[PDB]
Amino acid sequence: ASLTEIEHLVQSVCKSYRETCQLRLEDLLRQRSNIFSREEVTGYQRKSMWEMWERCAHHLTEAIQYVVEFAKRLSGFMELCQNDQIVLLKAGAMEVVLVRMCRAYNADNRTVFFEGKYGGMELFRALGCSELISSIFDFSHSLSALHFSEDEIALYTALVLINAHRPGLQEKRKVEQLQYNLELAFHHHLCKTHRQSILAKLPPKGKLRSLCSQHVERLQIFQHLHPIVVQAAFPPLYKELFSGGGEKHKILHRLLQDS
Ligand SMILES: CC(C)=CCN(C(=O)N(C)[C@H]1CC[C@H](c2ccncc2)CC1)c1cccc(Oc2ccccc2)c1
Ligand code: NA
Prior knowledge:
The chain has helices at about 5-20, 25-30, 40-45, 50-70, 80-100, 130-145, 150-160, 170-190, 205-225, 225-235, 235-240, 250-255, and strands at about 105, 110-115, 115-120. Helix 4 crosses helix 5, helix 6 runs antiparallel to helix 9 and helix 9 (about 205-225) packs across helix 10 (about 225-235). It has one domain (about 1-259): Retinoid X Receptor (Orthogonal Bundle). It has a three-stranded antiparallel beta sheet. It is built from twelve helices and three strands; from the N terminus they run H-H-H-H-H-E-E-E-H-H-H-H-H-H-H. The two termini are about 30 Å apart. By secondary structure, the protein is mainly alpha-helical. Bound molecules: the ligand CC(C)=CCN(C(=O)N(C)[C@H]1CC[C@H](c2ccncc2)CC1)c1cccc(Oc2ccccc2)c1 and sodium ion. It is found in: Nucleus. Belongs to the nuclear hormone receptor family. NR1 subfamily. This is Nuclear receptor ROR-gamma. It is classed as transcription. The entry lists the keywords nuclear receptor, nuclear hormone receptor, transcription.
């Protein structure tokens, strides 16, 4: 790689992210005053556990679909073989979503934008997975302290996805080369903007790994309690990525062949 090749990669990654960021940051910032009232919070707590699980799985599935589009527009991703594209998305799409979520998190009052308004952890009490919920809020709180720019989220989420250590990669050297160029693009941009200090403050990879692991652990607990709800009302892509065995569906393959 070269310098001009890396500067071109920065603008390419940022462009691919702007086209797929799902929610406008300005919209999220303007809605900070719009907070769920105590009566609305009580309504969410009164909903059944299985209805809250269905709505959250639907919101995650929608967010993951924008991450799949981010990957398809990400330089070098479609050059990889279809096995490696699927391995990288199965392992990283949820992680990219968890990072993108800090844009919807307000560290001032410890609330998150959810279904039109901002609400705290107590909004999600009906799910019956308080440890997972608090972990999600803590992770978003950690990233808020860094004051990420939009270009920084673009370059960082690209690296979260292009991880040459994921098990099952067939062309490991090809993914290594792509990750190295993206790492250079990230660091070059942090150097050009005098933001290298955040490198030591980025969360360890095990933090994103623990979140995904908790989500699968809590999903299995819920699937045991309401199996027909998962079977009949959860999104098919969600079941393919997270529920055992849900893998037979082949939705990821269709999203990648499309468009
Ligand atoms: C449980 C909870 C606190 C919230 C429900 N939900 C959720 O808010 N989302 C998916 C948003 C993720 C961030 C998205 C976005 C995109 C771009 N810019 C800003 C934000 C917008 C959708 C969510 C979060 C994280 C794991 C998750 O998976 C679960 C969790 C519990 C049960 C089932 C699935 C859902
Ligand atoms: Na934030």
